[PDB]
Structures are given as C-alpha cells and as structure tokens.
Design an enzyme around this catalytic site. Structure first.
Site, PDB file in Angstrom:
ATOM      1  N   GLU A   1      -0.980  50.654   9.686  1.00  0.00           N
ATOM      2  CA  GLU A   1       0.475  50.541   9.418  1.00  0.00           C
ATOM      3  C   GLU A   1       0.855  49.147   8.925  1.00  0.00           C
ATOM      4  OE1 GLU A   1       2.736  51.680  12.806  1.00  0.00           O
ATOM      5  OE2 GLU A   1       2.504  53.858  12.407  1.00  0.00           O
ATOM      6  N   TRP A   2      -0.040  48.163   8.992  1.00  0.00           N
ATOM      7  CA  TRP A   2       0.275  46.824   8.444  1.00  0.00           C
ATOM      8  C   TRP A   2       0.329  46.835   6.920  1.00  0.00           C
ATOM      9  CZ3 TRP A   2      -3.560  43.530  11.855  1.00  0.00           C
ATOM     10  CH2 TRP A   2      -3.091  43.511  13.163  1.00  0.00           C
TER      11      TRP A   2
ATOM     12  N   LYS B   1      -4.626  47.102  11.181  1.00  0.00           N
ATOM     13  CA  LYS B   1      -4.083  47.319  12.536  1.00  0.00           C
ATOM     14  C   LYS B   1      -5.037  48.198  13.354  1.00  0.00           C
ATOM     15  CE  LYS B   1       0.027  48.944  14.905  1.00  0.00           C
ATOM     16  NZ  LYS B   1       1.310  49.675  14.735  1.00  0.00           N
TER      17      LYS B   1
ATOM     18  N   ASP C   1      -2.589  42.758  19.714  1.00  0.00           N
ATOM     19  CA  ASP C   1      -1.476  43.584  19.167  1.00  0.00           C
ATOM     20  C   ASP C   1      -2.040  44.694  18.278  1.00  0.00           C
ATOM     21  OD1 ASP C   1       0.467  41.952  20.492  1.00  0.00           O
ATOM     22  OD2 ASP C   1       0.131  40.445  18.933  1.00  0.00           O
TER      23      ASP C   1
ATOM     24  N   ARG D   1      16.005  51.952  23.489  1.00  0.00           N
ATOM     25  CA  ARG D   1      15.171  51.564  22.340  1.00  0.00           C
ATOM     26  C   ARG D   1      15.412  52.428  21.102  1.00  0.00           C
ATOM     27  NH1 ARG D   1      10.468  53.547  20.421  1.00  0.00           N
ATOM     28  NH2 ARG D   1       9.182  52.132  19.183  1.00  0.00           N
TER      29      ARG D   1
ATOM     30  N   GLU E   1      -1.652  50.180  25.789  1.00  0.00           N
ATOM     31  CA  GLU E   1      -1.775  50.458  24.346  1.00  0.00           C
ATOM     32  C   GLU E   1      -2.739  49.485  23.665  1.00  0.00           C
ATOM     33  OE1 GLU E   1       1.972  50.156  22.509  1.00  0.00           O
ATOM     34  OE2 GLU E   1       1.288  50.891  20.553  1.00  0.00           O
TER      35      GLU E   1
ATOM     36  N   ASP F   1      -0.616  61.123  17.222  1.00  0.00           N
ATOM     37  CA  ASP F   1      -1.310  60.879  18.511  1.00  0.00           C
ATOM     38  C   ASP F   1      -1.705  62.189  19.172  1.00  0.00           C
ATOM     39  OD1 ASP F   1       0.225  58.587  17.762  1.00  0.00           O
ATOM     40  OD2 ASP F   1      -0.163  57.746  19.755  1.00  0.00           O
TER      41      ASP F   1
HETATM   42  O1  LIG Z   1       8.893  53.853  16.947  1.00  0.00           O
HETATM   43  C1  LIG Z   1       8.962  53.062  15.786  1.00  0.00           C
HETATM   44  C2  LIG Z   1       7.598  52.540  15.314  1.00  0.00           C
HETATM   45  O2  LIG Z   1       7.157  51.651  16.328  1.00  0.00           O
HETATM   46  C3  LIG Z   1       6.027  50.915  15.783  1.00  0.00           C
HETATM   47  O3  LIG Z   1       5.676  50.003  16.809  1.00  0.00           O
HETATM   48  C4  LIG Z   1       4.898  51.864  15.532  1.00  0.00           C
HETATM   49  O4  LIG Z   1       3.805  51.088  14.959  1.00  0.00           O
HETATM   50  C5  LIG Z   1       5.309  52.963  14.577  1.00  0.00           C
HETATM   51  O5  LIG Z   1       4.324  53.986  14.463  1.00  0.00           O
HETATM   52  C6  LIG Z   1       6.565  53.623  15.123  1.00  0.00           C
HETATM   53  O6  LIG Z   1       7.039  54.596  14.179  1.00  0.00           O
HETATM   54  O1  LIG Z   2       1.171  55.471  19.456  1.00  0.00           O
HETATM   55  C1  LIG Z   2       2.231  55.572  18.493  1.00  0.00           C
HETATM   56  C2  LIG Z   2       1.997  54.852  17.209  1.00  0.00           C
HETATM   57  O2  LIG Z   2       1.706  53.489  17.571  1.00  0.00           O
HETATM   58  C3  LIG Z   2       1.422  52.664  16.481  1.00  0.00           C
HETATM   59  O3  LIG Z   2       0.988  51.457  17.118  1.00  0.00           O
HETATM   60  C4  LIG Z   2       0.227  53.108  15.633  1.00  0.00           C
HETATM   61  O4  LIG Z   2       0.114  52.285  14.484  1.00  0.00           O
HETATM   62  C5  LIG Z   2       0.452  54.570  15.244  1.00  0.00           C
HETATM   63  O5  LIG Z   2      -0.756  55.112  14.649  1.00  0.00           O
HETATM   64  C6  LIG Z   2       0.782  55.399  16.468  1.00  0.00           C
HETATM   65  O6  LIG Z   2       1.105  56.774  16.092  1.00  0.00           O
HETATM   66  O1  LIG Z   3       0.652  44.985  15.762  1.00  0.00           O
HETATM   67  C1  LIG Z   3       1.791  45.518  16.468  1.00  0.00           C
HETATM   68  C2  LIG Z   3       2.905  45.712  15.457  1.00  0.00           C
HETATM   69  O2  LIG Z   3       2.427  46.639  14.472  1.00  0.00           O
HETATM   70  C3  LIG Z   3       3.386  47.011  13.479  1.00  0.00           C
HETATM   71  O3  LIG Z   3       2.782  47.974  12.621  1.00  0.00           O
HETATM   72  C4  LIG Z   3       4.641  47.635  14.126  1.00  0.00           C
HETATM   73  O4  LIG Z   3       5.606  47.917  13.118  1.00  0.00           O
HETATM   74  C5  LIG Z   3       5.235  46.673  15.135  1.00  0.00           C
HETATM   75  O5  LIG Z   3       6.313  47.393  15.781  1.00  0.00           O
HETATM   76  C6  LIG Z   3       4.171  46.247  16.142  1.00  0.00           C
HETATM   77  O6  LIG Z   3       4.694  45.234  17.022  1.00  0.00           O
END
Ligand SMILES: OC[C@H]1O[C@@H](O)[C@H](O)[C@@H](O)[C@@H]1O
Ligand SMILES: OC[C@H]1O[C@@H](O)[C@H](O)[C@@H](O)[C@@H]1O
Ligand SMILES: OC[C@H]1O[C@@H](O)[C@H](O)[C@@H](O)[C@@H]1O
Ligand SMILES: OC[C@H]1O[C@@H](O)[C@H](O)[C@@H](O)[C@@H]1O
Ligand SMILES: OC[C@H]1O[C@@H](O)[C@H](O)[C@@H](O)[C@@H]1O
Ligand SMILES: OC[C@H]1O[C@@H](O)[C@H](O)[C@@H](O)[C@@H]1O
Ligand SMILES: OC[C@H]1O[C@@H](O)[C@H](O)[C@@H](O)[C@@H]1O
Ligand SMILES: OC[C@H]1O[C@@H](O)[C@H](O)[C@@H](O)[C@@H]1O
Lengths: 659, 659
Positions: free
Chosen positions: B450-451, B516, B551, B52, B594, B322
């Site tokens: 993060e959206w 998100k 999600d 990955r 998750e 985290d």
């Molecule tokens: O690992 C790459 C990215 O994966 C996404 O699913 C997560 O939301 C991000 O926090 C992470 O940086």
């Molecule tokens: O758990 C790793 C990452 O996952 C992503 O889904 C979340 O948006 C981030 O806040 C988190 O750090």
């Molecule tokens: O809601 C889940 C999605 O959140 C986004 O912020 C991440 O970039 C994706 O990797 C993830 O699948």
C-alpha cells in the site's frame, strides 16, 4: 444557428431564456443566462413530499457549479463583459460559456455531467489575459430552500503528492426522507507546492464557499477544474462519505482521464444516429431530440425518465406511460440496452403493482398511473387519472413484449418479461366485465383522451387490454407454459365500437367532443389493431381536427405524421411532423415545451413521439409481430434528399431512404 | 508456561497487560487484569458512526459480567488478594481467574461465550471458605460512553418453581442506528425458597446493579452463575424482549445443559487440529492461532471476521481481503463450513458490490476495500485504498473458486459461486485498458504494497485479475455455460513485467523502494501464477529485505516461510515462520499485534497467514487446480520431530510429516 451538432446562443437574454440541460441519466444541470452559474440541478431517484400535488417529487438540488470570478477585485457582471456566448455541444453534452472581461482577458468554461460516473460533474475554466492580472475564484455551495438541516464542511485530504481541498454540504429533503451530500474540489495543473491556497468562508446559514487568488501574466492561459459529486441516501447508505470518496477518486483520476472516459461513452451513444440531407434545421432538431433522450436515460440500470427527464421538476419526476409508449420505442430500436433499463424499472416495481391491484379489488399487477421510488401510485389525489386511467398496465405489457420481439432474448423473457406479462394479463382478466351478449367491457375509466373521465369502453384502453392478453398468451407459448384459455377468449371479445360513419368510437359517450390527444388513432399506431388503410384514414379524417391548438400536449401530431407516412402521403406526414414540435419551441436553444406556446421545457415525451415519426414513419421501421425490425412502405418530406438511420436492432443495421 | 492447551498469567500486571478474548463468532469478551471484571465486549454485526475514520464501526458494548465481591463488608480488589492467576483454556474457550482472599476464602470464576447460543454468556463463581464469612455479590450493568438514551430495568419472572430476577438495560448506538439490549440473571443451585433475595439499585444515570448477601460457614463451597444475553436490532427486530426471553431460556436450560452443549461444539472444532512434537512453545502458539480463528468465526452464518476478529475495535470491525486471502484458506482446509460462512458474507453483499461498480463507472461487482453491514464501501475517505485498492474484487473471486475446488459442491457453485465469479469477471473486463501493443493494463491503483499509491500494473492486482478471469471461465465450463471469450483473451495478455535482473516488477514505477508487505511474492503463493522455482527464489532474494522492521503488518513473513518450505529450505522457512509473529507478541498470553513491537492485538489476519505457513508450507498441503487437497514437497524445522494435521478436506484426512 444550423450547426448539426451544436446549439449556440449569442448574448443570453434573461427576460426570454429557457436553459438547456447536460445530463448522464443521474444528474441533470440546467443552464443559467448568468455566466459561471447554473439555474437548477436535479438528481434522479431522489423523491420527497414537496410543492406540487402533495405527493413525492424531485427536489431542486445544490447548484454545485456556481462560481464567482473577479479580476483585481472587480467581479464579472453581465454589464462588464462582451462577446458573451453559450454553446451546447450535443456530441459530448458539453455546455460552454465564453466572454471577454473588458480589455483584460477572455474566459471559457465548459461543464459536463460525466457520462461514465453517474454522480460526478466537472467544469473546466480557461482564462487568457491580454495584460498582467490577479483572479479571485469562489465556488459557492448554497443550500437550496428545498433542503433543510444542512451542515457545511471543509477539509484538506493530503499525502506527499496532493492537497485535495473538499467543500462538502450535507442536507435533508423536506420530510427527512433522503440525506443529500455534495462534495467539490478544485483541480490544478501546477502541483501541490505551486497550487493556490484555498480559503473557506461560512458566513451564512445556507451558504459556504471556497476561494483562491491567482496571478496570471500578460499573454498566458491559466486553466483549472471544479469537480463535484452529488449523491443521496436513495443511492448509497452513507452519502456523506461516498460523496467525498468520489470527489477524491475523480481528483486523482484527473481531468484528462475523466474527459476521455466521458467522450468514449458519448461516442458509443452516437453510433446510433439520424442523418437528414436537404434540411439543416430538421437535422439539428432531430439531433437535439436524440441528445435529450440519450442524456435522460442510462444503460445497465433500472432508471426510467419522467416526461421532462432531468430538465427540471416537470410532473414531479414521476414515470408515466410516457416512457413505455413515447420514449421507449425509439430507444429500443437505436439502443436496446436503454430500453432494457426502462423495462427493468417496471420489473423491479412489479410487487408494488401487485399491491395496487389488491388494494383496488383486482388480480395480478396493476401498474400505477404515476410511479416514483416504490412503484406505488404517486398521482396527486385531485387528478382522477391516478384512480381511473388504467391503460398504463397494458402499456407496460406492450413495452415488455416489444423488448422480446426486438432482442429475441428468451432468458430475459423467462426471468422478467413473463412475470410482467402474466401478472398484467391477470389484472385485465379481472378488470373486464362480461355482458349479456358475451362481449367484454372495461367500464368507468379515464381515457387516453384524459378530457373523457369516468366513461366506458375507451378505444385505447380496450386496445391495450386486447394486446396485453394476446402478448401474455404468445409469451406462454414461447416459454412452453400453459396460459389460461380465458385470456384469448376475453381478448377476442373486448369491445371496440364504430360510429354510424364507420369511425372508431373513442368511448361509449363519444360523439364529436374535442379530445386532448390521440386515443382512437393509437389503435392504428402503435397498437396495429387497425391495419385496414381505409379505416386508418377515416379515423384520421374524423379525429385530426378534434385536438384544440391550446393546452394540448405533444402526444398526437407525431402519430398523425407517422400514420400519413405509412399511407404514403408526404405533404400531410411533413405537415404533422412540423406541427408536432415547432409550435412548442423555446429560445434560445429550441428546447421543447409540453403544449403549443408552452413555457415548461424539456418535454422528453414529445421528442420520443417525434423520433417515432422519423424512424417508424419516414424510415418505415416497424417492430415485426413475429420478431425483429422490418421496414414497411414510407415517404420522405419533399425537401428531404436523404434519411440515414444507423445502429438499428441487435444487428446494428443502417437504413438509407431517398425519393 | 508451555501447556499445549492453556495460556496462564500469574499476578496480572495492569501496567503491561494485553487481555485475551473468549468468543463464539458473535460476542467477544476481552479480559481485564482486575478480578471479576472484563475490559471490553464486542457484538458482531452491529456498526454505527463512532470515533476512528468517520465511518461505521464496532461499538464497545456492555461489560455485562462486571461483578463486585465483598467478604464481611470488605471489597475484593487487586491490592488485597494473593495467589491471583488467570488462565485461558483453549479447549473450550473458558477464561478462569482464581485468588485467595486473606484467611477467608479461595475464589474461582470461569466465563464463556456460549458456543451454541450466539447471544448468551455465562460466568460460574466458586467460593471455598477457610473461615465463616458473609459475601456480598453485585452484578453491574454500566452503559458504556459509546451508547446513549439508556433505560435500566429490573423484574422478577416467577412461577411455582422459579424466581428469575432479570437485570436489563436497553440503549442506542451513537446515531440511533442500532438498539442494544442486555439481560442478566443469577442462577442458584439451592432453588426458589432458599436462594438469596436480589436487591436492585439505580443510583447513577449510566449504571444499575443487582446484588445479594450469602452467609457461608467455614469449609463449605458456594457456587452460583451469572447468565447474560446481549443482542441488537441488527440481529432481531425486538432486542429488548428477545434479550429477556433468551436469559429466561438459558436460566431454565440450566448451567449443566448450557456447558455440555458448549463443550460438544468446542470438541467438534478441535477435531481439526495441528500437533507438533519437539517444540512445546510452537505447539502452544499454533493452538492459540487456531483457537482465535475458531473463536472469531461461526459455521452456518454469513459472518466474516475483521482483521482483529472480536478482540476489540481494530480496523472498525470492517471486513477486508484479510478474510479471503489470510484467514479463509486455513479454515477452508480444516473446517470448510467456516469458509462457507466467510464467502456467504460476500455472496449476501453482491448487490452492494454491483452498486459500487456502477458508482465508480465499471461493470459487474466491485467489492469494497472495507465492508461492514450493507456491503458498500466503508473505508475512511482519507485512506486512498477505499477509492483505488481494487485487488479485493479478485481476492473474493479467488476464495469463491477455492471453496468449490475443496468441496466440489456444484449446487453451491451454480447458486452462489458463479454469481460472484461472473460479476467480478465482468468488473475486471471493464477495468482493464488495451494498449497499442494489444496488452491489457490496470492503471492507477493502490498496490497490495500500500506504500505504492496511484501507480500502474501492480503485480498482485494484475495477478488477481488474471485469476478472477481464468476461474470465472473455468466455473462457466463446470456449469455448461460459454464464458465470454474476451475473459480468456484479457487474462492471457494482462501485463506482468520483469526488471533487467529477471525479478517480477512490483509496479511500473518500481525500482528498489521499500515495500509495506508481500506483493510480487504473492504471485508465487497464493496465486501460483509463478511456479518456476528459480523465478520464485529470484523474487524472494530481491524483495525479502525490502520490508522494514517498523510499521509493517504481519502479511509477509508467513508467505516467505511457506515459499521457502516449498523450496525445501528448512533453515530459511523456520527463520521466516518465527519472524512472522514472535516479534509481534504481547504479554501475558502471547497475543499477536499487527506489527513488530505493536500493542494492538489480536491480529487474526497474522494468525491466518502463519497457519498457512504451517499447513500449506511445513505440511505441504495445497488446493489442487483440478479439485481437492494435494500434498507437495515440504520440509519441517530442524527441531520439529513430527507435524500432525487432522480433519483436512471433505474426507477429513490426517497428514503426518517427519524428517
Ligand atoms: O482503514 C483505513 C486504512 O487504514 C490503513 O492503515 C490501512 O493500511 C488501509 O488498508 C485501510 O484502508
Ligand atoms: O489489516 C487491514 C489492512 O491493514 C493494512 O496494514 C494492510 O496494508 C492491508 O493489506 C490490510 O488489509
Ligand atoms: O506503515 C503503516 C502505514 O501504512 C500506510 O500504508 C497506511 O496508510 C498508514 O495508515 C499506516 O500507518
Ligand atoms: O491519474 C490517472 C493516471 O494514472 C497513471 O498512473 C496512468 O499512467 C495514467 O494513464 C492515468 O491517466
Ligand atoms: O406527460 C404526462 C401526462 O401529461 C398529460 O398531459 C397527458 O394527458 C398524459 O397522457 C401524460 O401521461
Ligand atoms: O400529475 C397529475 C395529473 O396532471 C394532469 O395534468 C395530467 O393530465 C395527468 O396525466 C396527471 O396524472
Ligand atoms: O388540457 C390541459 C389540462 O388537461 C387535463 O386533462 C388535466 O387534468 C389538466 O391538469 C390540464 O391542465
Ligand atoms: O432444564 C434442562 C433439563 O431439563 C430436563 O427436563 C431434562 O431431563 C434434562 O436432561 C435437561 O438438562
């Protein structure tokens, strides 16, 4: 061609052309006479065994900006363009080419080594069409013959708002020591839906390219940018991913935000400036010297420039006393944070200097004649300078003490200056030999006049030992630490001899030989061990005709100029100022070669010395033994109406001189 | 199935089975539904390019406990055993399988990631016969497809008292970055002369095995142990010899001494505990959360957990905020030495954060979005979080300051806390932009939501910058240093905006988008920038329905629960407590995925947030801005008769809450 901020070239002549450099202290890009190409790209901090010397070297890198432009299938050629011009804007390190393609369109292209992003480059291209046309644009990533085991990649980075097409190469330096990654993208104004489709071709083993077509209508401008990131395993453990990440970052910052940050950092650099009224050619030349030193250094780092900075592979990219004695002093006065990076280079290499001392049978830290990544000796073994030119250790000590004299930073002195001064003094205490008369000798060296090899009691070397021991003792006093009393006893008895005419003798075998460069005169400036004006003058009169016209580097006449300014001799000071660099220029941008009539620009060392002749000579500015910057008596050239030097010392003082 | 210390599975169903983990903070072993096998083994601190993301990752390692058992030549399988049960004892991290084989024997096996020996594992097998039988026992070392260039060794270590047969494999991670060694032995009760002869077979490229036969008369118990050591070149320069040395060491320590030390360390961890009366399911669930955080961390190290700990390759084993915001706070209160290891991870990587800052054009330390071995950025380049999600730097600062508030360790603050707080404050001072109104902006980030990508003045990001600058200024004062006055001027004027309804605006482009995860609500807890109870409630009311069911990760509802507990709203606090993890459970051990209905356990981040809802929410425990742990007003769920939290703060206080 006397613009005080711009160097221009009408119709570049490939049969007599020496390119100019844009650089941010990390990447240098040297210009090509060919439109939309660059000649050479140099990355600081990346060394491997390669060509000259059988030792570490800078490596020619990806010419990452190389572009082919075609109008309706006809490629732009030097034979089918007119009004072709190139310009270096020294205010922001923008290199611009501009031309007309037949009767169809005008093209301008400006590129930058982004001042705030050490590993990022940008070129902006503008096309103005007088008729409806279709452009084809190709960006080529050719792996240079210096690199091996390349891989050529291409991908799309997407979200709902963007499609960032990345053209990436990864390759290795000759022995595999360093992995290099480069990643380029095109940035378009028009948005994801309207941007041109990017095609990828991989037709050669050593070249791949990305390309697009764009229809432009009569009387319209089309503008796009090429952004590239260039980084190695010497800078980051994962250069492949960091290069793509950087280019994605830069693409989503956008052209406006990148150029604004670039401009802000250049504006800050030019807050320290030199202004000459009455001599537009001198104004332009001095701005070029400052421009190159600012381009070839970087605040808040441990980077130090080679004699040629990032203008090419001159002296394999190695660091010499060229920094401490030639480029460091003007930077310490104008921008102490640049000088801090230069001495940080040495601080972080103190352990390698201790290892060199132990291997050669001495105590303390013995800095190498030539330094690169590790701080071990890097001088080619056929050059006796590596084994025997020992004054570099004293040159490093002198710069460390000067940093403290100018800044007054006692926390820096405790943490960094004293480690350097203590270890270098321990080296000299172990390097001297006491004779029957109780005098201290330094036997069997190569002199600063490098034509004198395996001789005894070189004036400049002995002087640097005296200053190193004195400055280490002074430093101990400042910090409240007890120094060996032997350091002062030795400093006071190291031999500096005179010939029967009262002239400082360059070394024990010296009578009247031609010399390569200033040596005995360096005891007057920079060491200030000789202050008696009659002695300064008798040494100038004896030695000034001893440097031949041919194959002598730009490390002499700037000192003569400065000493004659201090003696208030305007005609001799100006004679030596011009002689220091005007006979060394190359067209069409008046870049500086190492020697008179030389063809190996850009000799940053030479620019550093001439900047001392201007600031410390014509300006009379001096690093006071007691601390701070003071002004001594000076004269201006007859034809200079006013000399204004801004941003001097930690108080950022302006000095104005007139007749 | 509501044992407060044990998680049990009857007849593991391989079509719907999520294994449980035993771990010691260095090795994690994830269970298989198959008898006497393990699904996956993960070694902390070992990263290479693998699957990955095209970035560093944890690597699936040797399934070193895999055994084949045969009774009178008949192979033990899922299909020919009965009364098959698995059990995790959370008191000592023992995973136990038990089954009946036809009319011949009852088998029990218990395995352990030894708590005191980071690189050592042990399994104990007990066979209780109902008839005469002969067992064949094989231990298999299969090189996983993740490793290459394996070598398979076997030898006898002998003296007058022992024959230690060692089954050893050495192999490499995909790029050759890391050499892995594993060494296993059988330990017998009966001693050298009577122990079974051990055969070695090398029949496959990727598997070798050691085996023995043993006759057991009816109505007898026969026990033996398998001891393994697993270590890499990331942990020791010579893993091959260290693995054999460790297994020899463990064999001559013996099973009793190994299990006694294991038990003592687990007993110490459980001196900090959460006891709930009136809700046996909640008591077991909260014990599982504590058990996983304890298993996935290690006092007296520089280890930090990934979002999935050692339960697998979730998020490539990278370290994120985290840790700082989700897993760190409950550990700081229960076991400050665990929190010390978590912030030690960042302290050790401060230089890599300084390097990232310089590459991206900032000052100070810029911690990466994702961290692994070096502390450089490890985020996949197609995730814009790596380039633009900057709040992680402030999250590290907040955890550093909290460590000092709870412990009062001024020596730690001088040596480690202040280096972090000073460098991260310098980053934010360089990251902000002053606008025409004299306000400070943080432009073009990815939000904690993060959206929201490439937006301006994210509430959570801006809040972390405020706290980082404030806490750095407070830290300077503790150490008698004058912080740059600019840090307070910037902190006091960083934008946090409200919409027309008085609700905290998530970012400058935010109106009513789905989000998100918690972002603006994090200004109430953990940042405590929002203390006004009406503002807290207005923000909960507007945002609590903005997080979709699908999600969305377990980084929201625990905060809602805690904030409603602090508002003394028992029904809403309990609603959000259950919603935070019960919809995320996987059978048969109630491991946590998750997202709601997810299938990627174990999400240690989720457990950390829920433990905050229990300790800081229901328990009302809070990190006092002036130092130490204080208790604020809280409520319990209706059905909880008593909440007892033990081992809190450096005074190891017990808190009891009732209705
Ligand atoms: O690992 C790459 C990215 O994966 C996404 O699913 C997560 O939301 C991000 O926090 C992470 O940086
Ligand atoms: O758990 C790793 C990452 O996952 C992503 O889904 C979340 O948006 C981030 O806040 C988190 O750090
Ligand atoms: O809601 C889940 C999605 O959140 C986004 O912020 C991440 O970039 C994706 O990797 C993830 O699948
Ligand atoms: O992409 C960079 C841009 O991001 C936007 O969100 C900001 O408002 C702009 O000022 C900035 O130039
Ligand atoms: O510029 C590098 C070196 O070049 C030689 O020509 C000079 O003699 C040295 O003093 C100088 O250090
Ligand atoms: O690089 C090897 C040598 O080259 C000579 O041309 C220079 O004069 C020396 O200073 C240098 O050490
Ligand atoms: O004068 C120029 C010559 O000077 C000598 O000191 C160097 O060793 C030579 O490399 C150089 O060609
Ligand atoms: O091998 C380990 C054993 O060694 C003996 O020497 C000790 O007396 C025991 O206490 C210990 O458990």
């Amino acid at each position: 061609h006397q613009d005080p901020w711009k160097l221009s070239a009408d119709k570049p002549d490939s049969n007599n052309y020496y390119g100019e450099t844009v650089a941010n202290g990390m990447i240098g890009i040297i210009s090509s006479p060919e439109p939309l190409k660059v000649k050479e790209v140099v990355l600081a901090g990346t060394y491997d065994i390669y060509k000259r010397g059988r030792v570490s070297s800078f490596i020619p890198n990806y010419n990452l900006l190389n572009m082919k432009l075609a109008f309706n299938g006809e490629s732009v050629q030097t034979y089918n363009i007119n009004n072709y011009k190139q310009e270096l804007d020294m205010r922001n390190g923008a290199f611009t080419g501009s031309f007309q393609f037949k009767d169809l369109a005008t093209v301008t292209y400006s590129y930058y080594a982004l001042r705030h992003l050490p590993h990022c480059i940008m070129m902006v291209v503008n096309i103005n069409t007088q008729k409806d046309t279709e452009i084809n644009v190709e960006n080529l990533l050719e792996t240079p013959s210096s690199l091996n085991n390349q891989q050529n990649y291409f991908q799309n980075i997407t979200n709902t708002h963007v499609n960032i097409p990345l053209l990436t190469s990864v390759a290795f330096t000759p022995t595999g020591r360093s992995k290099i990654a480069v990643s380029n993208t095109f940035l378009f104004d028009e948005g994801k839906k309207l941007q041109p489709e990017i095609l990828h071709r991989m037709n050669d083993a050593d070249m791949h390219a990305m390309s697009f077509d764009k229809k432009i209508k009569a009387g319209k401008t089309y503008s796009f940018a090429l952004i590239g990131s260039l980084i190695s395993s010497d800078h980051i453990n994962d250069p492949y991913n960091e290069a793509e990440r950087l280019t994605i970052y830069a693409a989503l910052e956008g052209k406006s935000r990148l150029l604004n940050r670039h401009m802000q950092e250049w504006n800050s650099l030019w807050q320290s400036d030199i202004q000459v009224e009455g001599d537009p050619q001198a104004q332009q030349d001095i701005r070029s010297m400052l421009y190159h030193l600012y381009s070839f250094t970087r605040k808040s780092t441990s980077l130090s420039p080679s004699p040629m900075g990032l203008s090419g592979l001159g002296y394999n990219g190695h660091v010499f006393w060229d920094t401490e004695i030639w480029m460091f002093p003007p930077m310490l006065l104008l921008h102490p944070e640049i000088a801090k990076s230069m001495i940080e280079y040495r601080y972080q290499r103190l352990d390698a200097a201790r290892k060199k001392a132990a291997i050669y049978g001495y105590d303390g830290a013995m800095f190498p004649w030539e330094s690169a990544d590790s701080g071990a000796e890097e001088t080619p073994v056929n050059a006796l300078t590596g084994a025997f030119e020992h004054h570099v250790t004293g040159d490093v000590a002198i710069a460390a003490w000067q940093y403290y004299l100018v800044t007054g930073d006692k926390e820096w002195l405790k943490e960094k200056g004293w480690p350097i001064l203590k270890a270098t003094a321990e080296f000299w205490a172990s390097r001297v030999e006491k004779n029957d008369k109780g005098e201290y000798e330094i036997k069997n060296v190569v002199a600063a006049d490098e034509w004198a090899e395996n001789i005894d009691n070189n004036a400049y070397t002995n002087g640097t030992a005296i200053r190193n021991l004195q400055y280490a003792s002074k430093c101990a006093t400042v910090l409240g630490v007890i120094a060996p009393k032997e350091w002062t006893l030795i400093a006071d008895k190291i031999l500096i001899s005179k010939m029967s005419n009262g002239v400082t003798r360059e070394h024990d075998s010296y009578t009247d030989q031609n010399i390569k460069q200033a040596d005995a005169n360096l005891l007057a400036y920079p060491l200030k061990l000789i202050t008696d004006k009659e002695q300064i003058e008798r040494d100038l009169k004896y030695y000034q005709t001893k440097i031949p016209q041919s194959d002598t580097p730009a490390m002499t006449q700037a000192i003569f100029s400065l000493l004659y300014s201090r003696l208030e001799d305007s005609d001799q000071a100006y004679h030596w100022f011009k002689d220091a660099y005007q006979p060394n220029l190359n067209p069409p941008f008046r870049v500086i070669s190492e020697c008179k009539g030389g063809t190996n620009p850009y000799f940053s060392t030479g620019a550093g010395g001439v900047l001392q002749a201007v600031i410390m000579g014509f300006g009379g500015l001096d690093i006071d033994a007691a601390g701070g910057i003071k002004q001594v008596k000076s004269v201006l050239p007859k034809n200079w109406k006013k000399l204004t030097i801004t941003g001097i010392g930690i108080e950022k003082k302006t000095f104005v001189l007139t007749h």
